[PDB]
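Intended use. Records like the one below are meant for learning the mapping from a protein sequence to its folded structure. Do not use them to infer anything beyond what is encoded.
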Amino acid sequence: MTFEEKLSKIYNEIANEISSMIPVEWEKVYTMAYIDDGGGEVFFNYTKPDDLNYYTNIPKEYNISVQVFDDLWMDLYDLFEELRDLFKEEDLEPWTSCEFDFTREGELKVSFDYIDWINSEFGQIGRQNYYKYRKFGILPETEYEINKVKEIEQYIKEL
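Structure written out for the chain above:
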C-alpha cells in the first residue's frame, strides 16, 4: 500500500465516522483537528438543508446517548492521530492542524497547517474561535474572546 492509499483509507474512515455521528440528514460538514505533542482535540460543525450546528450538541437535541457519541468521538480523534502518525511514519513534518470538509454534493477538502500553536501559548478555545473567524465570518460572543482572537491574529501575522 502506497502513501496515497493509506491517506485515502484513513480519509474514508474519517468521513464515515463523522457521518455516523450525525443522526439526521446533513448538507455541509466542517471538521477541524488540532494535534501536537501536547495532546489535542477534534471538533466539527454541520449544516442542515445556513446555520452551523456544533457537534457536542448532537446528543442534547437528538436520540443518541452521551456514551455512544463520546465513543465515536474518541474513535474519530484516534483516526486523526493515526493520520498524523502516518506523516511521521513517512518522514514528513507532522502537521499541527487538519481541516476536513465535505458536502452532501460530494465536495471535499483536506488541508494541513503547521502553525506552532504551542509557542503561541494560546489554548483550545482561542484556537477554535480564531478558526471560526478565519474559515467563516463568525466572531465570539464575549469581548474577552474577541480580544484573544485579535491577539492570535497578530501572532500569526508576525510569522
